[PDB]
C-alpha cells in the first residue's frame, strides 16, 4: 500500500493506490483506501483491510455524531485527538497482526491564513501523531519511495492540480519500487483514487483526470 498527502496553496490533496495482497498473491485491484470522512477531512489507511475500513467508517461516524450532538463540528485538533485515541485503542490487536495506520489530511476552516489552512497528520501504531510542517507525507509499504520522490518534486507544487500530479507521480514511483503498491493499470482502466480539499470542502477527484496525469507520466518516462 501507499497513501500520499501534500499541501498546496489553498488546500491539500491525498491519493492512494488500488492493490490488495495476501502474501505475494494479488487479491484485489480496485480497492479504495482514501475516504472523505468529513466535509473538510479525508483519511487514508494502510494495513489490514478489515482494520483499515473499520477505522475509516467509525471515524466518520464519530465526527458527525459529535457535530449533530453539539451543533458544531470538532476543531481540527479534536479530530486529530479522536483518531489518535482510536488507533491507540487498536494497539493490542495490532501487536497480534491486525495493524493499520492512518494518514489524515484536512482543511482547517478556522486557520488564520486560508493559504496555509492545509493540514497533514501522520500516526504511529500507538496513537502518536505528527502534524507535518514540511508539506507532504506518506504511509504504507511504499511510503519511503513516495516520500523520497515528493522530496524532489514538491517544489513544482503551486496549485491543486500540480499537487495532484505530484501525488500521482509519487504513487507511480512507489509502485515502481514496491510490489505491494499497484501502479496504473492501463489494460483495465484502474488508477489511484484522490481527494482534494480546499475552502469549499472535500471532493473526489474524477477518474479521467487521474488517468490523463498517469498517462502523461508514463509516456514521459518512455
Amino acid at each position: 500500500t501507499t497513501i500520499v498527502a501534500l499541501k498546496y496553496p489553498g488546500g491539500v490533496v491525498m491519493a492512494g493506490d488500488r492493490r490488495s495482497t495476501q502474501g505475494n498473491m494479488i487479491s484485489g485491484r480496485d480497492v479504495r483506501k482514501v475516504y472523505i470522512t468529513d466535509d473538510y477531512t479525508a483519511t487514508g489507511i494502510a494495513g489490514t483491510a478489515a482494520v483499515a475500513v473499520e477505522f475509516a467508517r467509525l471515524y466518520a461516524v464519530e465526527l458527525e455524531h459529535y457535530e449533530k450532538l453539539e451543533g458544531v463540528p470538532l476543531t481540527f485538533a479534536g479530530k486529530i485527538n479522536r483518531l489518535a485515541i482510536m488507533v491507540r485503542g487498536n494497539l493490542a490487536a495490532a501487536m497480534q497482526g491486525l495493524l493499520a495506520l492512518p494518514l489524515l489530511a484536512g482543511y482547517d476552516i478556522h486557520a488564520s491564513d486560508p493559504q496555509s489552512a492545509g493540514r497533514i497528520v501522520s500516526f504511529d501504531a500507538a496513537g502518536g501523531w505528527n502534524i507535518e510542517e514540511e508539506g507532504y507525507q506518506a504511509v504504507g509499504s511504499g511510503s519511503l519511495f513516495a516520500k523520497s520522490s515528493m522530496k524532489k518534486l514538491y517544489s513544482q507544487v503551486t496549485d491543486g492540480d500540480s499537487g495532484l500530479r505530484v501525488a500521482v507521480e509519487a504513487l507511480y514511483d512507489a509502485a515502481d519500487d514496491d510490489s505491494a503498491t499497484g501502479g496504473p493499470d492501463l489494460v483495465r482502466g484502474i488508477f489511484p483514487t484522490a481527494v482534494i480539499i480546499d475552502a469549499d470542502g472535500a471532493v473526489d477527484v474524477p477518474e479521467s483526470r487521474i488517468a490523463e496525469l498517469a498517462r502523461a507520466i508514463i509516456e514521459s518516462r518512455s
Partner: protein, 217 residues
C-alpha cells in the same frame, strides 16, 4: 393507579400547553420545520440522520435528552448495519417506546411533544413522512403537517385551511408562520429537510438568509 396516571397526564399536558409552538409541514422540496424560539443558541429543531429530522415542544432539558438519545440510536444503527437502513419510522418507534417508559416509570413525566420527519434519498421519489409522538408514547402518522406545543387547535386549523401540497419553500414558510400567529428571525427557528441535497438533507435557515426568505416574493 388510575389517579396517578391521570395526574401524570394532566401535568404533562399542562406543561406542553404552556410552551411555545412548533409546526412541521411537507412542501415540494422536502419537510419544513418552523418553531417559535427567541433563544439564540438553544435549539428545538435538530438533525437526526442523513434524511431524518427532529423537532420538539416543551421542556428543554427533557426533549434535548430525547434528541441526544435519538442521535445515538441512529448513529448506532447505521454503524451496525448501514446508513441507508436508518429510517424515520424506526426513530419514531423508538421515541414512542422511550416516552411510554418515561411516562409510566420515571419520577416525573416528560413535558414534551416530538416530531420525527423523513424525506426521500437523493434521486428517489418517495413522499415525505411526518410522525408525531406525544408525552405518553402515542404515535401518529401524518401526511401534511404536525403541530405541537401551546394552543394547538388554532394553529392546526389555520394550517388546515391554508395548506396545499407541494408548496414552494417561501409559500410554505409564510403559511407556517401565519398559522403560528393564529415574528421574525430574532424570534423564529427555521430549518429544512431538503430532498435535493445529495447526502445530508438538514439545513438551517438563519439570519440574513432567513429574513431574505421571509420577505421575498
Amino acid at each position: 393507579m388510575e389517579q396517578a396516571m391521570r395526574e401524570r397526564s394532566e401535568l404533562a399536558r399542562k406543561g406542553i400547553a404552556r410552551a411555545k409552538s412548533v409546526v412541521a409541514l411537507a412542501y415540494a422540496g422536502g419537510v419544513l420545520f418552523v418553531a417559535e424560539n427567541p433563544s439564540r443558541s438553544l435549539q428545538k429543531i435538530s438533525e437526526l440522520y442523513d434524511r431524518v429530522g427532529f423537532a420538539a415542544a416543551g421542556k428543554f432539558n427533557e426533549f434535548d435528552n430525547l434528541r441526544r438519545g435519538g442521535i445515538q440510536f441512529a448513529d448506532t444503527r447505521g454503524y451496525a448495519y448501514d446508513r441507508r437502513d436508518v429510517t424515520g419510522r424506526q426513530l419514531a418507534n423508538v421515541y414512542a417506546q422511550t416516552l411510554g417508559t418515561i411516562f409510566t416509570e420515571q419520577a416525573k413525566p416528560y413535558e414534551v411533544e416530538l416530531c420525527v420527519a423523513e424525506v426521500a434519498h437523493y434521486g428517489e421519489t418517495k413522499r415525505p413522512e411526518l410522525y408525531r409522538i406525544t408525552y405518553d408514547g402515542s404515535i401518529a402518522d401524518e401526511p401534511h403537517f404536525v403541530v405541537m406545543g401551546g394552543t394547538t387547535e388554532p394553529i392546526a386549523n389555520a394550517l388546515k385551511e391554508s395548506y396545499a401540497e407541494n408548496a414552494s419553500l417561501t409559500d410554505a414558510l409564510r403559511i407556517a408562520v401565519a398559522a403560528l400567529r393564529a415574528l421574525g428571525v430574532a424570534s423564529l427557528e427555521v430549518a429544512v429537510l431538503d430532498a435535493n441535497r445529495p447526502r445530508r438533507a438538514f439545513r438551517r435557515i438563519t439570519g440574513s438568509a432567513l429574513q431574505a426568505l421571509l420577505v421575498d416574493q
